[PDB]
Structures are given as structure tokens and as C-alpha cells.
Structure 1
Amino acid sequence: SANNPWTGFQIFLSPYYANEVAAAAKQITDPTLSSKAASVANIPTFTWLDSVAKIPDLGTYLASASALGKSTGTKQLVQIVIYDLPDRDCAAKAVNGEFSIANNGQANYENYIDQIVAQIQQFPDVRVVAVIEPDSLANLVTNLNVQKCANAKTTYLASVNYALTNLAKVGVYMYMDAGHAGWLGWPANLSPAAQLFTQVWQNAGKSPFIKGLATNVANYNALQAASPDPITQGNPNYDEIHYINALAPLLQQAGWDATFIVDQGRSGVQNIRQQWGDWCNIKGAGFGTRPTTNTGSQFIDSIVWVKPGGESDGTSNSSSPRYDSTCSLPDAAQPAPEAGTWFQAYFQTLVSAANPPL
């Protein structure tokens, strides 16, 4: 499209990820690996607003970005993930997330959005790009047979709508999460997916700030695969570019000339999964293509690092109340700590296996 949110801006680098990476490079013993590892703090990632407790961090990042822009003669851009739906991750094996539908989820999520909007409103010289609710809408395409998802459907739709509608009022550029090629890219899932995303776009008033969709968030697919990963058998859309090429024209026909962003933060190593649906701490993953607007596709505004590689996807300890058995599969790195916390051994391999190399 004409207006790529990233062009003409400097991305604000997460100080939280930078601090994690610096501490990790010190725990890495080999000096050559260590310098490459240390350089990861300079690679832009998304900040996950996975709880209300993270909202004050957003405020500090906006204010820091505003001051940095003035100090360096740049316009700054802060990258966030909206990730706090009630009954979050409905098809997962474990309950996570602070809000529940049965305890005023909708009002509490709305208040979470209101607190985010109230921060963003105070810093109009900082641009914000938000990924909207990974692992939400995609479940409403393929997983309505999952009872938790069926029962969450109206709440997910209403809550995502509230986020889109109100973040648009403060000019946030938004990409709704849209799964990945092995979820919604199956040809038979494309039309149902397009129908859902276009209904969501319509309900939020077709705001031009709703730029499109984010794919491969927290996943491992290639953007452009050299050859199909064996996990993809049966699906001609074996990588993200095939998925996006197939989905984009369906959205265009609805009057939404959508554009896309694609997570590649853990895509450096292909052919590492037994089954395509295995998502948790996949062993042998490497850092992938670094964020860039040089995407190779008319539909793709940016390659991004949404999931911050090195932070766990979930614990492998079956005694944890947060335990999802996907995190104990043969292709999951074990033992693994709680979701969101630092997983040092996993980070070190991401560095060693990076492709292109660091």
C-alpha cells in the first residue's frame, strides 16, 4: 500500500529484551557466539501486553521513545501485542490469562483497552503498531467444535472489536492475528477466514488504521520455503507467502485492500517439527530473517519479530497449573520454564542456528 507504517520511522528497541539478551550473552561462554548473541538486543521485537500489569511499561516505552526521537532527530515507533482476551487461548490445554468470561471478562478487557488507549493518547508524536490478539480469531474459523472456543466466540468478537474500535481513535496501526499457513492457509479455510476477518473489519468501522493481518506470530513457518516442510503434506500453501497470496485477494474483494506482517523471529530453521500443530518451544529453532520492509511481496509491509525468541512458550512441568501437554512433546525443548520467562538454553541455540547468521 501507499502508507507502510514503518517507513520514515525508527523502531524503539525493547529495553526489556535488550536487558535479557545482555544477561544471556554473559552466560554464553564462547566469545564468538557471545558477540553475535549480544547483537540481538539491537534487533526490534514486539512488547507483549499480556496483562494489565504490563500497561505501565507501555507508558514508559512511549515516553522514552518520544524523548529519543527528539534527541536523535527521528520519528519513533513502538511495537506492541494486545494479548489479554477473557478465556484466552481457548483451544489450549491449560487455562492462562487473568480474565475469564464468567467473571466480567468483557468489562475487564474493555478496561484493559481503555488503560492502553489512555497511555497512547498522551504521546501523539510516537507511532504505535499493534498485533491484535494472537491465538484468538483463528480459533473461531477452525475450532468451533472446541467447547471453550464455542463458548468464547461472542466474547472474542466483542473484545477484539472493542480493541480495534478504540485503538483506532488514537491512530494505532493494527494487524489482526491471522494464524499461519498451517492453520488458516489450508485452501478450505481461506474463505471462512476471509469472511470472519472482513466481518470484524466491518464491525470496527473499516478504519484505515486496521491495515490488515499478522501471520506466523510465535510460530516457525518459512516465509518462502526452499522446499515444502514434510509437516505440510496435503496443503499447497506450505509457507506464509503462499497463504498470504491466497488470502489477500479475498479481503480485497470485500473492499479491504489488506496488507500483512509476518513473524520470522524463530523461522531460521525449517523441518524441525513432527506435526504442523506442534507450537511449544520447538527444539532446534533458529533466529530467522531480521525485521525489514524488504519483504518480497506486494502484500507484506514488514517481516517482524513478534514473539521474542528466548522467552518460553510454556512450562514442560506437568505439575504447573499452567501446563499444556504440547510443551512436553518429543519436539519441544525440555525442561522449559513458565510462558514468557527466560529460557537460556533455547536462546543460545537460536543464536547458534540463526539463518541468515548473526
Structure 2
Amino acid sequence: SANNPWTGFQIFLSPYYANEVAAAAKQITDPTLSSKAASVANIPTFTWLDSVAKIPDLGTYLASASALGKSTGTKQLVQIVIYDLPDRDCAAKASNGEFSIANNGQANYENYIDQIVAQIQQFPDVRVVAVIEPDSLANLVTNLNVQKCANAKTTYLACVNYALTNLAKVGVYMYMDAGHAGWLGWPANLSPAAQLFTQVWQNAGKSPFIKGLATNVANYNALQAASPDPITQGNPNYDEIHYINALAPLLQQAGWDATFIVDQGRSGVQNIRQQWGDWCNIKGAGFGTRPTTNTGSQFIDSIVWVKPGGESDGTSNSSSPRYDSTCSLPDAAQPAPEAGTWFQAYFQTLVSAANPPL
């Protein structure tokens, strides 16, 4: 579209990932690989606001970005993920996240949004791009048979609506999570998905700040694959470009000329999964195409790195209360530490297998 949120802005680089990366690179013994690993701290990633405890980090990043822009003659852009729904990840094995529907979850979530808005309101010279709630609305397309998802449906919709409505008031550019080609890109899921996303967009007032959708977040699909990965058999939309090319016109017809961002942070290596739904710490993943607005598609504003490669997707320890058996599958790297915590061996392979090379 005319207004690509990234054009003319410098992306604030996460100091946490830079340090996570910095601490990781000092442990890599081969000096050539260690220096490549260190350079990952210069690659922009999204900051996950996965709990209220992360909100003060958001405030510091906004203030730091504001000062850095003045120091360098640039306009700065901070990239965040809104990821704290009550009864989060309703179709996953085991619960996670600080809020529950049964304990004031929606109200607690709206206070979480209010705290985020109150930070963003203080720093109007910094642009913010937010991915809205990975692993949420897509469950309301295909997983309404999962009782936790059926019981969460009204809460997910109300909470996402509150986030969109209130972040728009402070000018945040938003992309709702929309799964990936192997989730919502199946031709038969496209229209139900479009109908859901359009209803959500309508309920939040069709704000121009609701730019569109984010795909492949925390996943591994190609943006454009020369040959279909065998996991995709049966789905003509075998990569993210096919999915997006199919979904976008349905949104346009509703009056929403939606644009997209696509995670490629762990997409450098294709054909590494037994089944398409295997999502946890997939072994042999490599860093993929670096973030860029040179996307090759009318519909795609940016290739992005949303999930920060090197942070675990979940523990492989079946004794943890947070254990999801997906993280013990044959194509999952093991042993793996708790979600969001650093998985050093996985990071080193992401570096070694990066494609394009680092």
C-alpha cells in the first residue's frame, strides 16, 4: 500500500536479544562462527510482551529509541508482540501465561493493554509496530472442537478487540497474527479465516492502523519455495506467498486492503519436518532471509524476524508443568529448556545453518 510502516524509519535493535546473542556468541568456540553469531544482534527482532513483567522493558525501549533517533538523525521504530491472552494457546498441550479466563482474565488483559498504551503515549516520536496475539484467532478458525478454544472464543475476541481499539488510539501499526500456510492457507480455511479477521477488523472500527496480518510467526515455512516441502501434500498453498496471494483478495472484497508481514527468522532450512504441524524447536532450522521491505509481493510490507531464534519454544522435560509433548517429537531438538529461555545449542545451529549465509 502507500504507507509501509517501515519505510523511512530505523528499527530499534533489541538490547535483550543483542545481549542474549552477545552472551551466546562468547560460548561459540570457532572464531569465524562466533563472529557471525555476534552479528545477529544487529538483525532486528520483535520484543515479546509475553507478560506484564515485560512492560517496563517496553518503556525503556521506547525512551532509548527516542534518544537514539535524536543522536543519529533518524526516526526510530520499535517492534513488539502482544502475547498475553487469558487461557493463552488454547489448543496447546498444557496451559501457559499469567492470565486465566476463570480468574478475571479478560479484565487483567485489558489492564495489561492499558499499561502498554500508557507507555506508548509518552513517546510520540517513536513509531511502534505490533504483532497481535500469535496462536489466538487462528484457533478460532480450525480448533473450535478443542473445548478450551471453544470456551475461550468470546474472551479471545473481546481481548483482541480491546488491544486493536486502544493501541490504535496511540497510532500503533498492527498486524493480527494469522497462522501460516499450513494452518489457515489450506484453500478450505481461507474464507472462514477471512470472515473472522474481517469481523475483528470491523469490531475495532476499521482503523487504518490495523494494517493487516502477520504470518509464519514462530514457524518455519518458506516465503517462496521452488519445490513444495513434502509436509504440504494436499495443500496447493505450500508456502507463505501462496497463502497470502490467496487470502488478501478476500480481505480486499470486505473493504480492507490488508497488507502482511512474514516471519522468516527460522526459515533458512526447508524440508526439516515430519509433519506440518510440528512446531517446537525443529531440529536443523537455520536463520532465514533478513528483515527487509524488499518482499517481492504487492501484499507484503516486510519480511520480519518475529520469533527470536535461539529462544526455546518449550521444554522437552516431561516432568515440567509446562511440558508440551510436541517438544519431544523426533524432529524436535532435545534436550530443550523452558519456553522463551535461551537454547544455546539451537542458536549455534541457527547460525551455522543460516541461509542466506551470515
CA RMSD of aligned residues (A): 0.3
- Deviation digits for residues 31-67 of structure 1 (CA, Å, limit 9, x no counterpart): 0111111110000000000000000000000000000
- Deviation digits for residues 313-342 of structure 1 (CA, Å, limit 9, x no counterpart): 000000000000000000000000000000
- CA drift at 1:260: 0.0
Q: Which runs of 5+ in 2 are unaligned?
A: none
- Deviation digits for residues 63-112 of structure 1 (CA, Å, limit 9, x no counterpart): 00000000000000000000000000000001000000000111000000
For 1:135 and 1:280, how far apart are their aligned partners in 2? 13
- CA drift at 1:159: 0.2
TM-score relative to the length of structure 1 = 1.00
For 1:303 and 1:45, how far apart are their aligned partners in 2? 11
For 2:274 and 2:12, how far apart are their aligned partners in 1? 36
Q: Give secondary structure in 2 for the equivalent of 1:273.
A: coil
Q: Give secondary structure in 2 for the equivalent of 1:101.
A: coil
Q: Give secondary structure in 2 for the equivalent of 1:224.
A: coil
Q: Give secondary structure in 1 for the equivalent of 2:155.
A: helix
- Runs of at least 4 residues of structure 1 off by over 4 A? none
- CA drift at 1:23: 1.0
For 1:27 and 1:291, how far apart are their aligned partners in 2? 26
Kindly tell me the number of residue pairs found equivalent between the two proteins.
358
- CA drift at 1:197: 0.1
Equivalent in the alignment of 2:36: 36
Aligned residue runs from structure 1 range 83-162, under 5 A: 83-162=83-162
For 1:28 and 1:308, how far apart are their aligned partners in 2? 18
Q: Give secondary structure in 2 for the equivalent of 1:80.
A: strand
- CA drift at 1:21: 0.7
For 1:115 and 1:357, how far apart are their aligned partners in 2? 40
Equivalent in the alignment of 1:73: 73
Q: Give secondary structure in 1 for the equivalent of 2:32.
A: helix
- Deviation digits for residues 126-148 of structure 1 (CA, Å, limit 9, x no counterpart): 00000000000000000000000
- Deviation digits for residues 293-314 of structure 1 (CA, Å, limit 9, x no counterpart): 0000000000000000000000
For 1:32 and 1:64, how far apart are their aligned partners in 2? 31
- CA drift at 1:226: 1.5
- Deviation digits for residues 134-165 of structure 1 (CA, Å, limit 9, x no counterpart): 00000000000000000000000000000000
For 1:67 and 1:101, how far apart are their aligned partners in 2? 39
- Taking only the aligned residue pairs, the percentage that are identical comes to 99
Q: Give secondary structure in 1 for the equivalent of 2:148.
A: helix
TM-score relative to the length of structure 2 = 1.00
Q: Give secondary structure in 2 for the equivalent of 1:275.
A: coil
For 1:62 and 1:46, how far apart are their aligned partners in 2? 13
Q: Which runs of 5+ in 1 are unaligned?
A: none
For 2:25 and 2:137, how far apart are their aligned partners in 1? 37
For 1:155 and 1:23, how far apart are their aligned partners in 2? 39
- CA drift at 1:167: 0.1
Q: Give secondary structure in 2 for the equivalent of 1:174.
A: strand
Equivalent in the alignment of 1:19: 19
Q: Give secondary structure in 1 for the equivalent of 2:102.
A: helix
Equivalent in the alignment of 1:292: 292
- CA drift at 1:292: 0.1
- CA drift at 1:186: 0.1
- CA drift at 1:214: 0.0
